[PDB]
RNA sequence: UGUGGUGUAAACGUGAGUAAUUUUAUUAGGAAUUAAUGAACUAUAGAAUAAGCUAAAUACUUAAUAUUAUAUAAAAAUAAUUUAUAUAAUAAAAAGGAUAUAUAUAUAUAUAUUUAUCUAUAGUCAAGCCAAUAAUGGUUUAGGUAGUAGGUUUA
RNA sequence: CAUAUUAUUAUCUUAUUAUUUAUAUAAUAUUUUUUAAUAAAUAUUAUUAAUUUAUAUUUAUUUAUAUCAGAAAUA
């Protein structure tokens with residue numbers, strides 16, 4: 001990543017139980033220091049799905065909470081997302097494929113869908 | 117004879133030394149402020165004729181440690197006159213007997229010479245003329261007489277012509293001699309015919325002036341008498357004869373420059 | 387194991403000093419109205435020129451080119467600030483590498499695709515200074531203080 | 542009476558650094574007047590290099606002030 005202002009993940013939770021804040025942080029401050037802003041949360045463990053529900057065909061859910069309007073503001077003023085945050089924001093529709101990379105570059109089984 | 121071997125070396129050391137500590141090393145009054153805080157004597161601009169007779173006794177080495185200097189040191193590079201080029205080609209072919217390595221050197225170091233504002237160091241009257249003069253001997257001696265082999269080398273030697281000046285006019289007669297000796301097709305873009313013009317050689321000249329004409333025209337005379345001897349056809353022109361006869365008449369003393377080189381071939385041939 | 391660039395003011399650890407001369411906490415506090423400062427990313431623009439020095443260079447030198455103070459008015463958030471204009475000086479830089487080709491005569495050049503360099507504006511992120519209130523015990527420490535308290539200038 | 546640490550100075554000594562006077566046939570660059578070895582064309586004329594000269598930038602030399610830290614004394 002580059003720049004003074006960066007959107008990255010700050011680790012919370014216990015050992016073997018990671019959770020994360022999506023935060024706007026100064027590049028120099030420690031990973032778990034109090035940031036400029038806490039944009040959201042990210043739980044890397046998918047929600048368990050029952051075996052019968054796997055027969056049904058549900059996909060396990062990875063939960064992300066996020067303030068979209070403020071995140072777009074921080075992207076706008078020049079804050080630089082990390083790789084994991086870049087992946088998260090690309091799949092939320094905030095960022096487009098221009099932020100993809102060569103390694104990260106396929107048939108769509110579902111389409112990004114916004115509900116109220 | 118080693119006056120050159122020491123003086124050119126000191127010149128090269130002086131010019132290769134960084135300008136930060138030239139004043140403290142070479143100036144006399146700064147000696148005290150050097151050793152307390154090796155010293156060499158001053159170095160003054162060096163004569164072109166000083167290196168002329170350095171060839172008369174190594175030369176490949178000297179040329180390599182000489183031309184490896186940085187391009188932007190002008191004194192080192194501009195010092196080499198094309199007269200030196202002719203002199204060292206001649207001496208290399210005849211008596212030092214390492215002509216091939218010298219021509220390879222001069223080709224690469226020509227490619228380097230180009231970007232030092234010294235294109236004139238290669239010209240007709242001091243690089244090309246002697247180059248093919250030695251090429252004629254090269255063909256004659258071992259009977260290298262293939263057509264394409266000689267033709268391609270002629271073309272390459274025409275590439276290494278950084279002055280397009282051809283005023284004396286021996287260049288075209290040399291090309292004709294080469295082409296007829298081998299039998300190839302002398303195609304030379306850029307080259308043009310010129311009617312020959314050589315300075316008159318008076319027999320009432322001052323002794324210093326006599327040897328000055330001698331020193332200037334040693335190479336052109338070698339080429340002239342070579343071009344005469346290699347081909348009886350080249351007895352056609354009397355301006356080819358006037359200069360040669362006047363010169364060899366002025367050479368009644370001591371011996372010909374031509375004789376020594378031609379027997380210097382032999383003393384290496386065995 | 388040569389010259390260079392970027393990176394180590396952070397993070398980590400520690401609690402010696404520090405009782406307030408610059409420390410901490412708070413405030414929807416200020417001005418000196420904090421600099422032709424960006425540290426390092428955005429968004430736009432414009433540039434990227436010569437020598438010297440080192441073995442060479444995006445290394446170092448030298449040189450080229452690119453807000454404030456005056457004065458005129460305007461107003462009012464007025465006994466000053468702000469605005470616009472005209473000058474003065476601002477007047478201060480740089481850098482090239484990797485690939486393609488296209489010309490011509492390996493040599494240059496002309497384009498481009500890359501990633502770099504410099505400058506300007508704004509935005510982010512940030513810095514410097516000051517005020518108010520609070521911050522342990524002992525007066526068996528009761529007087530203390532001479533830059534001390536204040537004024538006027540200069541640096 | 543003895544040992545230790547902290548602070549202060551009309552005292553002494555003082556690394557370093559910053560200012561501060563004054564001095565250098567003191568250096569390195571630019572400016573002159575000259576002396577040297579090269580060049581070229583035909584007596585040279587220009588270049589590179591030393592002498593003297595006067596402006597910058599440094600070093601050496603010192604003058605003065607402040608200063609880590611010691612010493613002495615006092616608490």
Ligand SMILES: [Mg+2]
Nearest residue numbers: 001002003080
């Ligand atoms: Mg990067």
Ligand SMILES: [Mg+2]
Nearest residue numbers: 395396397398
């Ligand atoms: Mg620190």
Ligand SMILES: [Mg+2]
Nearest residue numbers: 397398399400
């Ligand atoms: Mg810590």
Ligand SMILES: [Mg+2]
Nearest residue numbers: 401402403404
């Ligand atoms: Mg403590």
Ligand SMILES: [Mg+2]
Nearest residue numbers: 437438442443
């Ligand atoms: Mg350069």
Ligand SMILES: [Mg+2]
Nearest residue numbers: 444445446481
């Ligand atoms: Mg630079």
Ligand SMILES: [Mg+2]
Nearest residue numbers: 407533534535
């Ligand atoms: Mg005070």
